[PDB]
Design a binder for this molecule. Structure first.
Ligand SMILES: CC(=O)SCCNC(=O)CCNC(=O)[C@H](O)C(C)(C)COP(=O)(O)OP(=O)(O)OC[C@H]1O[C@@H](n2cnc3c(N)ncnc32)[C@H](O)[C@@H]1OP(=O)(O)O
Ligand SMILES: CC(=O)SCCNC(=O)CCNC(=O)[C@H](O)C(C)(C)COP(=O)(O)OP(=O)(O)OC[C@H]1O[C@@H](n2cnc3c(N)ncnc32)[C@H](O)[C@@H]1OP(=O)(O)O
Ligand SMILES: [Cl-]
Lengths: 179, 181
């Protein structure tokens, strides 16, 4: 059975391999050239420095996928809004590993006191698995930026979905998370 | 009132632009900043937009800058290279006079000329900032989403309203080379 745990620096090689394959063959990522392992490490060190959780799914000593949270935008009024990203190795897809990862990410983001979790889903018309995954964990549709991306010779839509946490906007906020 | 003219931003405009933005940050929820940036930070932001190649425009009458508008990236990853975002701020005593429309119309023309295919408006506190929504509707932007409770400012939860305008055919044809390449 797979376990969800925190990202550890030794994972960065596999995670680069997982993300590299997503960049090259998929449209969930709007990057075109795969980042280097060092660049991936710098990106993850910035997230952790901000205080955001970075999680990996591991079975039989191998990293099956990863998910992390970050800011949608950084201006201070946005400080109760987080964004999720999740990538699963192709040989591990369709096994329930995405939902396990995202379920735990929601719990961590919720405990940090965020009020909204945003999915910015690249090529949402085509990446049905991403939309279904988020619907299955209670995200609701909140917008669609048409023709926001062009990659592999076609236009891509960005599907936006959000999940309220800790009462959402119906209650007064607490202190800023990560403050 | 003398007709405002639209021209490219000049570095010496930054003092007035900072004054305009400061008043908006302090008294309004269109911006999700809380503490107003300094004039030197504003200068650095505008230099960076201009370095990327984005147009920055001001409306000027009787020697005074009455408002400004600029474009920038929504997000910087390469597949987004045909998507731009607009920002526009008008001085309080110049609002409701068509200056926002004059500036945004010319920004659309300049951004279209660069080969972008979509122009995105990310409107803070859309429930309250009707002027922002109406300005963008009046120039053909269509609603494309609403992030509820995206901001908290001035004691209130705020919704972000998203609107977009296709340019040069939008997503109906293959794009040209990346703008600003
Ligand atoms: C905001 C974001 O990060 S969006 C994701 C961006 N990342 C990518 O696009 C990278 C490539 N894709 C992936 O990494 C993965 O396939 C993901 C993230 C889309 C899903 O991860 P998975 O491990 O495959 O998901 P998991 O097995 O937990 O099931 C996901 C849910 O969506 C459904 N689903 C998963 N894959 C598919 C698919 N290809 N087609 C249709 N439905 C699918 C499942 O049925 C399940 O919901 P259910 O309760 O109705 O059964
Ligand atoms: C993505 C963005 O940048 S959103 C804007 C962010 N900026 C701010 O919030 C700062 C504070 N507000 C402002 O700077 C300005 O008021 C703006 C930019 C929202 C609008 O600019 P203005 O010059 O006031 O608008 P302008 O007079 O040009 O009117 C544009 C259109 O919107 C309409 N409109 C403007 N304000 C309102 C209002 N409060 N209620 C109803 N309609 C309005 C006008 O009737 C006009 O439409 P029409 O030509 O069909 O008659
Ligand atoms: Cl000058």
């Amino acid at each position: 059975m797979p376990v969800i745990r925190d990202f550890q620096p030794a994972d960065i090689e596999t995670i680069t391999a997982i993300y590299t394959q997503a960049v090259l063959t998929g449209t969930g990522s709007y990057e075109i050239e795969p980042p280097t392992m060092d660049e991936m490490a710098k990106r993850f060190a910035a997230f952790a420095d901000q205080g955001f959780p970075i999680l990996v799914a591991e079975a039989d000593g191998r990293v099956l996928g990863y998910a992390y949270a970050s800011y949608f935008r950084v201006r201070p009024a946005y400080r109760w809004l987080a964004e999720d990203s999740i990538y699963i190795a192709p040989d591990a897809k369709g096994q329930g590993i995405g939902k396990l990862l995202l379920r735990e990410l929601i719990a961590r983001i919720s405990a940090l006191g965020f009020r909204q979790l945003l999915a910015v889903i690249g090529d949402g018309e085509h990446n049905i698995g991403s939309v279904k995954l988020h619907e299955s964990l209670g995200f609701t549709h909140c917008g669609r930026i048409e023709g926001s991306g062009f990659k592999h010779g076609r236009w891509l839509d960005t599907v936006l979905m959000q999940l309220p946490l800790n009462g959402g906007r119906s209650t007064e906020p607490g202190p800023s998370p990560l403050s």
